[PDB]
Write a protein that binds this ligand. Structure first.
Ligand code: HEM
Ligand SMILES: Nc1cccc(-c2cccc(-c3cn[nH]c3N)c2)c1
Ligand SMILES: Nc1cccc(-c2cccc(-c3cn[nH]c3N)c2)c1
Length: 393
């Protein structure tokens, strides 16, 4: 037989029985990635947290020439370290402020947008596609608003993303075409005097502030492209697969409809059980480091399997069960942990809470319109998502 291959399954509606057997028997194990490289797959909560909290397991070094790769880069190497470059440029606080859901009018914009999407679907009549015609448009709208760019520009930026977030053994020609086009767009946004709000409005002013005169124009455009893309794919994909989890649980659907104040606790459990990340998070060892029974050598690739941690019964008892009263509810790794913890975590939570709240109010009888096994799971992609999510109500 051959070395165990990753990823195990592109299905995002159920975790393979194999994850638990692996966590029990070999919570750090050698695997082969789609490039042919070997890697260490880490699947216990204890060992996942160890790796993510040890900066000697480096994110930015995964982009080094000649390194073992999970998949091919779809961006310039520089972009892997985007957050680090943001911090170095003195821009961290400004970016963080721009992407909080606490911005005035933001939460109202999201409710209005979700309700308008849902009303259109209702007028159209069942079946409706909750990914393409609800979750992703809601994510796209949200990020145009957060960035301060026109809503009409959202769809064009969105269309890059089915290629941008591919998980490919080889470089993708279309990825560079789309990247360069999107950078040109964001550079234009920075020169556009009408753009005065949101992240791009603030970046446009900092660009002309003397305290930032030696920060490159390319970094400013890059922040816009990177935050739009990673945000839209992460929120759209999470909400989509969370809606599947909810639809599959009519009693939970009914409980949250009846007591919407439990929706935050519900979204937090839906984050914990979410299978939207298709691959472990990659890190490259910059030293020889003991992880469980394995001495990981300098230059080796480590993959942090988020559902490994998040379904670990030693940390989350009855891990497949959605429990709204856990003692450790936010201690999951859905947003990562440590140096690279997600800066959009609050925005992601609110996108999902508001989307779910609006759906349950508009479509209290929502159900799948096809048998679950008929969902088509996107392959060789950095997220697990159904190509369409047909529902009736
Ligand atoms: C439900 C929504 C989201 C989920 C599940 C999610 C998940 C994650 C995870 C797991 C990481 C850690 C990656 C690693 O350590 O290798 C991360 C980092 C990051 N996220 Fe998110 N994310 C979400 C929303 C967002 C949003 C809305 C934005 C921006 C608008 C965003 C921007 C980023 C960035 C820039 C990083 C890299 C941070 C760094 O390198 O220090 N994410 N996210
Ligand atoms: N929301 C999210 C989740 C996981 C990773 C990122 C993120 C943010 C910035 C850059 C990169 C990136 C681009 N190429 N390779 C990597 N790791 C990835 C964002
Ligand atoms: N080629 C392309 C075009 C537009 C956006 C992006 C993009 C933007 C942000 C993150 C990533 C990415 C690629 N691999 N992993 C991550 N997070 C990719 C790439």
């Amino acid at each position: 037989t051959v070395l165990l291959e990753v990823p195990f399954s592109a299905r995002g509606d159920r975790i393979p029985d194999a994850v638990a057997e692996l966590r029990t028997r070999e919570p750090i194990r050698k695997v082969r990635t789609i490039t042919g490289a070997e890697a260490w797959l880490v699947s216990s909560y204890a060992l996942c947290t160890q790796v993510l909290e040890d900066r000697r397991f480096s994110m930015k070094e995964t982009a080094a020439a000649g390194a073992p790769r999970l998949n091919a880069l779809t961006v310039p190497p520089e972009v892997v370290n985007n957050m680090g470059n943001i911090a170095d440029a003195g821009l961290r606080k400004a970016v963080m402020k721009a992407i909080t859901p606490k911005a005035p009018g933001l939460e109202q914009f999201l409710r209005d947008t979700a309700n308008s999407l849902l009303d259109n679907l209702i007028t159209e009549g069942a079946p409706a596609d909750l990914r393409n015609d609800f979750a992703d448009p809601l994510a796209t709208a949200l990020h145009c608003k957060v960035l301060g760019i026109p809503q009409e520009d959202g769809p064009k930026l969105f269309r890059s993303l089915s290629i941008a977030f591919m998980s490919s053994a080889d470089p993708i020609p279309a990825a560079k075409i789309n990247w360069d086009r999107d950078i040109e767009y964001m550079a234009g946004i920075l020169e556009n005097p009408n753009i005065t709000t949101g992240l791009m409005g603030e970046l446009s002013r900092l660009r002309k502030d003397p305290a930032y005169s030696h920060v490159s124009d390319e970094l400013f455009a890059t922040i816009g492209v990177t935050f739009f893309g990673a945000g839209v794919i992460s929120t759209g994909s999470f909400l989509t697969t969370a809606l599947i989890s909810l639809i599959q649980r009519p009693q939970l659907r009914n409980l949250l409809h009846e007591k919407p104040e439990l929706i935050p606790a519900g979204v937090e459990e839906l984050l914990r059980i979410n299978l939207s990340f298709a691959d472990g998070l990659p890190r490259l060892a910059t030293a020889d480091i003991q992880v469980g029974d394995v001495l990981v050598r300098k230059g080796e690739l480590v993959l942090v399997l988020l559902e490994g941690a998040n379904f670990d019964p030693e940390h989350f008892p009855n891990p497949g069960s959605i429990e709204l009263d856990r003692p450790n509810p936010t201690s999951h790794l859905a947003f990562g942990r440590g140096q690279h913890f997600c800066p959009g975590s609050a925005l992601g939570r609110r996108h999902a809470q508001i989307g779910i709240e609006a759906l349950l109010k508009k479509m209290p009888g929502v159900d799948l319109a096809v048998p679950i096994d008929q969902l088509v799971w996107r392959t060789r992609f950095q997220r697990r998502i159904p190509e369409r999510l047909p529902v009736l109500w």
